[PDB]
Amino acid sequence: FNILLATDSYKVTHYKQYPPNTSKVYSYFECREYEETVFYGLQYILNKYLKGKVVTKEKIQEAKDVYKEHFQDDVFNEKGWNYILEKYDGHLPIEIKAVPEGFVIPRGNVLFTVENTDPECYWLTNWIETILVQSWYPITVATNSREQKKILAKYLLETSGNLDGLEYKLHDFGYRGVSSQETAGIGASAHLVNFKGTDTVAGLALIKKYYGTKDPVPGYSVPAAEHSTITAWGKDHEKDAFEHIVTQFSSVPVSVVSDSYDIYNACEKIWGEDLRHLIVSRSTQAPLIIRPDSGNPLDTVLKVLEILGKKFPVTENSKGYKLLPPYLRVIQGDGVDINTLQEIVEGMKQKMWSIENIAFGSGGGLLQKLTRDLLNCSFKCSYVVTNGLGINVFKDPVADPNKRSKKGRLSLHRTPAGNFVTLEEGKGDLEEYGQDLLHTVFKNGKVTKSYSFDEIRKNAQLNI
Amino acid sequence: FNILLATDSYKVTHYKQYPPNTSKVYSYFECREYEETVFYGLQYILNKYLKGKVVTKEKIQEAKDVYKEHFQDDVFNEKGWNYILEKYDGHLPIEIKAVPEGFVIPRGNVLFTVENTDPECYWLTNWIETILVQSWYPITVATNSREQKKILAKYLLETSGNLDGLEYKLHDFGYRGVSSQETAGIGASAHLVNFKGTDTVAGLALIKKYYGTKDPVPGYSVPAAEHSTITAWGKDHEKDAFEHIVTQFSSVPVSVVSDSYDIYNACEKIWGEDLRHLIVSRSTQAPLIIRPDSGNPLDTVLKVLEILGKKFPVTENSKGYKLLPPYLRVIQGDGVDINTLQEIVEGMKQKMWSIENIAFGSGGGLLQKLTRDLLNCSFKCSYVVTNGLGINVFKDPVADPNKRSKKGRLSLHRTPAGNFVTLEEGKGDLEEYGQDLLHTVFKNGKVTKSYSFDEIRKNAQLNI
């Protein structure tokens, strides 16, 4: 990895565009205008990409040669980068202040700030904008996943009277559906801020290396079938596949995809009749989890529950909701996103089915179908020092008032009612709102403040 | 990187679920039936993750320890992995056959096939499904980018009579808007299959290392301003920022973001009057590229052109379309996706403005706002050998006929009309069509067939 080649190309030309005699460039990150966001992911970026000796003679030379051909010109600031290498032994003279990881902050508040610590490195602040703006992705995955936890908590509390097993109700199925291996690890780790169920193995090593947990692993999985392990038995031997799989995993929970040919027939005749004796004998700690994987997600879930409820002994819980026996559960792992999750739990509640009966598996909806536009994550310059005089800087486009940026030195404070407020124009210097809630997390190539994954989970907890 | 930890967790349990005495598991990838797809990206995956000694004693031990905690059970095929390490020195006994990279294939056709070459490694075929299915991402970026090239080619030919500069009309602005650094490189490389303009530097090193070009670089950029380089001058000094930037880049093309405060005022009064003398003196090889960055993308583009057309000498080309002078161009780099690109070029054509006047910059729309659902990229088992007898396997869900998978051994052929056909059930073995268009690209840990980035671009060319 070469930080000199980890920026948008046009940033290579910006050192020539700032007003002459600029000694300071101060910039901030916010999720402009999903009313609250989970701040997570910055620590990964600081450790993997920004800390220590990030500049070498070889990296300067590599970047010089690439930019010469990429621009068909020599616009690359070799002098500026050589200065960092000679003066600071390749350590970035940058200071980053951030809100603690796991923090749940309303939209339109400063989340982190970046500024150069050496007047010669005024151009460095916005050079690293590209790498830091990528924090949008673990922030959005964590926020969207927590918003799904809120829906699940509401319906589970309503239909069961408690939140037992909440942290296992939304399972990450997204490994194949993401754009890369690196995205998988980052995305799966952000989902693990709110839940404990994951199949995206990549997320576990990321948490271990960059955050750390008291427990040996932050996430868990159960054995489960795929279409290939059922279909390989042949069209006429689906019962044999099912029987073999539940016998191989007789003492542990097992998920079995049952829609290869006909989900309703598999539920009513195979599980419901032919193999029913192998299901009713299972332990409460080792249920059979039936998995539909096609059709309308809500209509399929309701029909599968109606079928199972007629083949198996259904009880009525203390809230008046139907509950499958403890050796039998369902997982809907096709077409699950925040909108369909909501339609399914509401549809289940209307048909008097307890949310304790179901878990959700989400792939693309959880980790891929997200953009920087969802929370409007933006990095903007708000303060500059030119000729020793500080000026409050901002954009305010005529056709888009929502794109107006904050002015001057920023500070995050607790209001008297215990809410959050961002103070602009260095007004935080007046001691009217107490202490700034951002902490120096990076200074001159060193990570100065870190959070464990346990702290992050605690900060990201629901009020509920 | 550890391939034993680069799969969906549940795949760790599948070796126990296949029918006993299974010696072969044969699977294929297709974009289930954007009528045609660009096949690109597999070569990157084969080289970075699948080739050479991918199994070591340390990797087996690491995976064993992780899976023990992840499952709270010892469900990990240590014996199977130890077999690969001892017999093949950690090289995968897999054979991958694929359509050549850059190939443009209609939906619902086999693109690549995977099968184990050793009977003991029947479970390996679908173990690597997760890593190979991630090919969906460079395939979708390449396909969506080529579809935008088709729209641009149609409107540029209609309004100018040629395709000059077509390869520079859609610029990659997506670095900050993607989920990770790795995604950035893969995504920007897939856009470079169709275009030459990129700011996502990461894509250049990926092409150089995995594909290679005769040219020193596959992509180019121009100097350009950002809001920070303009706003840093102060709200009252936007004209000074503009003047400084165009003077610093007087001899090369320069893009200048002009919507910081009021895009229409910047076009009419700053560029159109105060700085007009610095613009009209510019070379044809060094235009000023005005960049709006907010508002309704089409309304803003049309209003900017109407303003500029009244301040600068406009000509009418041989097709009857208005053309700005050669030292002045526009780039729309906000809210550009395949749908808005289409609305803008159609709206320009309706107002008699040539497409030679404009270029597009696309960020999230180009590299992030894509999912595996767009082309329905899917990996499925189609053939198995159990007890020495081959059987044609497939899924066919009752509620979703579109999810039906192909049966048996597959081959891709040219039809008599020169189209593509996928033959099922080993019917390709009858010599009724020509040669199978799938070639072995990977066999027993070695990459057996490679394509240069030059070949890929030629294969992905538009008919026009």
Ligand SMILES: O=C(NCCCc1ccccc1)c1ccc(NC(=O)n2cc3ccccc3c2)cc1
């Ligand atoms: O229901 C589940 N968890 C919570 C309840 C479990 C429980 C209840 C009571 C006692 C003990 C345990 C559950 C079900 C299925 C799965 N996994 C699958 O069905 N997979 C993994 C996939 C990954 C990618 C693509 C497809 C996949 C299919 C995981 C967890």
Ligand SMILES: O=C(NCCCc1ccccc1)c1ccc(NC(=O)n2cc3ccccc3c2)cc1
């Ligand atoms: O119009 C362009 N290229 C094709 C025509 C150029 C031409 C015509 C005639 C003769 C010589 C050359 C062009 C314009 C802007 C840009 N770049 C920007 O505006 N940037 C890069 C960004 C990256 C991230 C975020 C924001 C960005 C802003 C690049 C190329």
